[PDB]
Request: fold
Amino acid sequence: HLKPFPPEFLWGAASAAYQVEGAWNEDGKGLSVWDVFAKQPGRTFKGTNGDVAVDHYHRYQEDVALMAEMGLKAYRFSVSWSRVFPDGNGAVNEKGLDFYDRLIEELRNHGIEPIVTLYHWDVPQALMDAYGAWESRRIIDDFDRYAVTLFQRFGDRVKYWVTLNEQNIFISFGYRLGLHPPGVKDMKRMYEANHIANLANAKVIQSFRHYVPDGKIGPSFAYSPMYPYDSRPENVLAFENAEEFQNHWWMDVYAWGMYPQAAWNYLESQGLEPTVAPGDWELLQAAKPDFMGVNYYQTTTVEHNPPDGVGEGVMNTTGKKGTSTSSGIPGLFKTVRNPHVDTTNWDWAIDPVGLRIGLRRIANRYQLPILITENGLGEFDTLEPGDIVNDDYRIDYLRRHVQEIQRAITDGVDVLGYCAWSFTDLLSWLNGYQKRYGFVYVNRDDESEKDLRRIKKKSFYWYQRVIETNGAEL
Amino acid sequence: HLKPFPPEFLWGAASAAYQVEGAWNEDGKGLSVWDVFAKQPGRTFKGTNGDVAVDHYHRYQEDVALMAEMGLKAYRFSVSWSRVFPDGNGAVNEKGLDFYDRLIEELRNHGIEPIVTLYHWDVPQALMDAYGAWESRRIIDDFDRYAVTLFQRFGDRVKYWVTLNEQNIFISFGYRLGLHPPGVKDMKRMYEANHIANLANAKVIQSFRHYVPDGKIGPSFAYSPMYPYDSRPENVLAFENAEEFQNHWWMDVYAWGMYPQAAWNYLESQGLEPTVAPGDWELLQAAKPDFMGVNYYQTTTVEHNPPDGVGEGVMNTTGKKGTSTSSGIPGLFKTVRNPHVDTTNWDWAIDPVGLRIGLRRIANRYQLPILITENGLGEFDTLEPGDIVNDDYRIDYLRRHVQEIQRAITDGVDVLGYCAWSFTDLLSWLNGYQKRYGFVYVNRDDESEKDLRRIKKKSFYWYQRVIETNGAEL
Ligand SMILES: O=P(O)(O)OC[C@H]1O[C@@H](O)[C@H](O)[C@@H](O)[C@@H]1O
Ligand SMILES: O=P(O)(O)OC[C@H]1O[C@@H](O)[C@H](O)[C@@H](O)[C@@H]1O
Reply:
């Protein structure tokens, strides 16, 4: 007998500003690190970039009416820092704030709760130019000025806020794998920039307590719960290293203000541990979040990895199935295909029960409420004549994840809401446009913007029914 | 490259009073629940009991001389509450204390650190008679007065104290399985008593802060780290339930003063959850230990268990490799044989890597120093001509476990000490004498009491070498 979804459960959907807005040089917006990176040749699928994206900046009113028709209870979006401070830390672009004001007003006038994400990967280029952005401590105060600017302008209308969205991705993709800006492949610099982001996070949570005393705020972590391949003790041990190094490394800082010891000692043994200043631990420990945000797509299965063993593996940005290979850290763990789950064409595992597992781990380890800030399925959609999109594959994935969330709630996990990724189809950072996630199909591809028309997919009407019945009908 | 064992690593060995002392009714000793229980027919193997045991009450000077010979840095033993307070809560028996005084002196005079366990399963029968012993809150102040008496008398000479030894075992064997006193099979009662034992532990830790400010104290938990069978999500979930239900249920109370929420809820749903009074949570939260005692012998592998499936299973008393059967909780998990490790003839897993995993989990979850209070291998020893016991089997098991500890310390776990189980062969609670754990063979079997002469096994000299080389030579 399942607990019901609670009465104020934030049934939501989400986007990120670069992926959706366009208008990259309008109304005073400065360059982000992503405006600049995606235009370097070879960085992105087919040269795709966010110049136009799906033009949500101009078309937000249409998108909001669609949200209202779906009956959305919450919409999570991010603010483009480079629209508010074109040079990152100088004078404010009022026109940039005015767009988010019009957006928020449009949401409120249809009864939709705004969830504001402060940072979704788009630090202004001028901060990268002046001091290397997340690699310098200067960013702590610059990010704080920006956050407080938002808090003051919108704090009376926005109760739910997300600080850093998937810090583990933007930091590791940016500084270890070289796949995101600034395109660095240097572990030492990765862990230093990570430490600085931890500080910036805590700093803004602290300012939030002053400026938005009734709000709720948290970071959002990209969480792939680890599993051991089997009961072989070395594989279990690899599991312990993987969960600690990939997951606790961030979440313990967010929840407890502390890095876990074994991962710290491994880094220290390699000269990789971050530089710690007087006052750092005190800041990090005094900034407890109201919730842990969680972005969940899949779990990861691991096995023993000897010290001469696997390092970086092949990622899959095409969509040919079976092309991904093992990744790891030599001597600690490496990934392996989980034989007991399907995968998408991009090799992401489909593991709804894993969401239950990850939610149960976070409650068990931190006792924190959880806002699920992203979850969804990306696939090719076919637009059929008569503006029809039958995305049963997406419904099937959403249905099963939302069911497991109900199981977690029944187990006692305090889940505040669920934001499907994404509302409209949007631009993939690297993969272009054909890997779609939306409830609302957007008519464009990697080569032409077409008319950018919005077309409700079958999943739209499915989620609309989920919301109308508060989850009883899936 | 391994770190070495720290310079004052407490290389130890251990026992428990009932298992070793005898003298069950000498010098004013009152009856314990085990004195009564073991005499009930068919409870113990061939009616074996501890009237005499291995007669350590009278032979302690020989036993301590052999310890000094081995070079032991520490010796962990329990105090028999019924020697000290024959009625549990009336007047103190000075001759009871006097024995422990003499034993401590004997240990100091040979430079051996004594480790005093307050409770190893032998509560005075009068307290079971007067008010149900662990089922009543009265035991809390009674246990406290007993512990404070010890603190006052031996505080100046004993730095390391263990409070409750293997609470999960005496509670569970005593109130769920009915295998130990008080011979009950009733979960409501188990959890009530469990709760009272939690409070007792916290009360005496508090008292200890007042009475022995420079001492170190903690409970010691019987820890079988759980593993999932494989990476099937339902199997990993079953691992989450098992580790939380079997392990965190106790350790999070010792570390953080609170029960895990999901297990609590599941209890609450069955009507099994304990009764809580004003002040319980404040007391439990306020009783932080200096370390976690860990008694380790094996890990457990678990798998999905449906609502109709396994509950209580068959244990293995006989020694016939193969006779154990899955045990579980319907709906949550059940055990299953781990194909990747070996077992003893009693179906106990041999899994030294499990100990490193276990020590890594406690450090990762709680950040506590650990004192391994028991680890050991139980088997038949043959005494061969020339006073030779060739216990290679035993050396092999202990060596591998000590190696894995060194690895844990190298990972960053703070391990204060290791106490092999046991110094001399002793009496098993249920299984008699033939299943031996000692470094020192004691000349008796289940029939013939013979002379109880101490004979040094091969392992004795193995461990002698280990201590001499602070663990470099194994
Ligand atoms: O499957 P993709 O196209 O590589 O994208 C993954 C998505 O999921 C998360 O990784 C990001 O927060 C999103 O911004 C992104 O859209
Ligand atoms: O039943 P066995 O094989 O003798 O093992 C029991 C041992 O197991 C441990 O659980 C106890 O703390 C010891 O007191 C005891 O010696």
User: Anything to note?
Assistant: The domain at 1-474 of chain B is CATH 3.20.20.80 (TIM Barrel). Chain B has 15 helices and 16 strands.
